[PDB]
Scaffold this motif. Structure first.
Motif, mmCIF file in Angstrom:
data_model
loop_
_atom_site.group_PDB
_atom_site.id
_atom_site.type_symbol
_atom_site.label_atom_id
_atom_site.label_comp_id
_atom_site.label_asym_id
_atom_site.label_seq_id
_atom_site.Cartn_x
_atom_site.Cartn_y
_atom_site.Cartn_z
ATOM 1 N N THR A 236 0.816 -1.211 0.000
ATOM 2 C CA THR A 236 0.000 0.000 0.000
ATOM 3 C C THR A 236 0.853 1.264 0.000
ATOM 4 O O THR A 236 0.426 2.298 -0.527
ATOM 5 N N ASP A 237 2.052 1.208 0.585
ATOM 6 C CA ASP A 237 2.916 2.385 0.614
ATOM 7 C C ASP A 237 3.333 2.803 -0.791
ATOM 8 O O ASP A 237 3.339 3.997 -1.114
ATOM 9 N N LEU B 196 0.322 7.571 -5.970
ATOM 10 C CA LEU B 196 -0.853 8.432 -6.037
ATOM 11 C C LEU B 196 -0.466 9.902 -6.135
ATOM 12 O O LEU B 196 -1.140 10.676 -6.825
ATOM 13 N N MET B 197 0.613 10.301 -5.459
ATOM 14 C CA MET B 197 1.024 11.700 -5.477
ATOM 15 C C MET B 197 1.412 12.149 -6.879
ATOM 16 O O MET B 197 1.068 13.259 -7.301
ATOM 17 N N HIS C 274 -3.414 1.953 -10.065
ATOM 18 C CA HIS C 274 -4.823 1.704 -9.788
ATOM 19 C C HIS C 274 -5.193 0.258 -10.097
ATOM 20 O O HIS C 274 -5.879 -0.398 -9.304
ATOM 21 N N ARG D 157 0.394 4.553 -2.348
ATOM 22 C CA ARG D 157 0.228 5.920 -1.866
ATOM 23 C C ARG D 157 1.275 6.847 -2.464
ATOM 24 O O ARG D 157 0.976 8.000 -2.797
#
Lengths: 256, 256
Positions: free
Chosen positions: B210-211, B217-218, B229, B214
């Motif tokens: 998940t890191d 995502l930025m 995604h 994230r």
């Protein structure tokens, strides 16, 4: 060398000057060619014959012979024999090999060489009058080849009408008579205007940044100031070859 | 060894760089091949020549050596002679014979070798973006092979658009240092629109399941989040060098 002296002395008794330079061109050349015979002729002798254009007392860079690691390996083996001494990094030739054998035997590659002796110096033209000269070759040997090719290069590439090469030659060489030796035996069909103008230059030349242009200004009678303008736009005798620790001096009675 | 050292010093004394790598193409290549004359070309030398497709100093897997068990005994006896050291089962090649022996001499088997070097990774593909790369070879060689073949396969298997390579290479090498060495020069085969995106992600790379999502995502202007995604659907510089502990450290004065 002992053998040349012995053969010359023996030749003289059967003239001190005819046998000194003219005669024995078929006896000494025999033995030196016999020594030469060791080399593989196809590759080596031709490169050697390429070397006749150089001054008898001259040193040779690698690029010039390359024009006329293959080249460096070749000169390496020819040196390995005994024919071309390399030093760190110009290269020279034994005279006993230089001025006797290839002097006698040569083709007309001289022109193909001498135009190359114009080809690469023409490339050595800079924005200003500071070209990347070689200390011994480009300063000294260039005069022979430029006289050999044609006249018009004489009023441009030796920069006698210019001013910078004077500074280059003077500062890089230490010294002056070696220039005069190239200033007198280099006056060919360069026309009345220059025949005489460079003679007027030469009369002043042995008599001695901004200093050079200012002194060129005085010789307004000559076009030296004419190009000194673009440059700035962009004690009769004195010895310095001896640097220090000198005591006294005196002069020959017979002006000698 | 005290053979290449000796010959290289000889050549340099008889250019430190031309004779270092460029010259000796006839004298370091004869001996590097004269020693190999004890072999046969039917089985050994042919595959050894094919092995030139691999990097100058790297490894070779058993399967990839196979597609370019008979190959296993072949390389076993080659190891026996002195050609290919076999180790547990990654296999590496001596750099001297890979580099100076077979670089100059190479027939056009590179096309089939490189199309196979693309075909095997395409087979080594999974439903997710986790391909069965071997520990060292594939990570360090897929980039070179993709740059060798064409740009779209680089676009796919470099995973500059995908996010899984950023995880796999970083967590199988420890570092991203060599990943940067992959990204920086491998720019040629794609499109400049992809190349500027690769430039942006390359600039982002040295700064940092998940890191990773994230973090990706930025970065919104890049397709890395676009593939992240699907992946989830389906700081500053850090070294971490000595495994025990660390006491003191400092930076050089000249930032060197």
């Amino acid at each position: 060398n002992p053998r040349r002296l012995s053969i010359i002395a023996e030749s003289i008794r059967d003239a001190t000057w005819d046998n000194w330079k003219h005669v024995n061109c078929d006896k000494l050349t025999t033995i030196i060619e016999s020594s030469l015979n060791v080399l593989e002729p196809a590759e080596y002798r031709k490169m050697f014959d390429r070397l006749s254009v150089f001054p008898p007392s001259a040193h040779i860079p690698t690029i010039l012979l390359s024009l006329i690691s293959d080249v460096m390996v070749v000169v390496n083996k020819l040196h390995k024999y005994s024919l071309v001494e390399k030093q760190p990094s110009t290269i020279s030739i034994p005279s006993i090999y230089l001025e006797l054998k290839v002097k006698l035997e040569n083709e007309y590659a001289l022109h193909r060489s001498i135009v190359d002796h114009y080809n690469i110096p023409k490339t050595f033209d800079s924005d200003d009058l500071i070209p990347p000269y070689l200390d011994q070759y480009f300063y000294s040997h260039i005069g022979h080849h430029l006289k050999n090719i044609e006249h018009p290069e004489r009023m441009t590439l030796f920069r006698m009408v210019f001013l910078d090469f004077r500074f280059l030659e003077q500062k890089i060489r230490h010294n002056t008579l070696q220039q005069l030796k190239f200033y007198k035996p280099y006056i060919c069909d360069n026309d009345p205007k220059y025949e005489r103008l460079v003679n007027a230059i030469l009369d002043f030349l042995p008599k001695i940044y901004t200093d050079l242009l200012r002194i060129a200004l005085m010789a307004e009678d000559e076009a030296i100031f004419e190009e000194a303008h673009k440059q700035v736009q962009r004690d009769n005798e004195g010895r310095h070859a001896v640097y220090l620790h000198n005591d006294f001096c005196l002069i020959a009675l017979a002006s000698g």
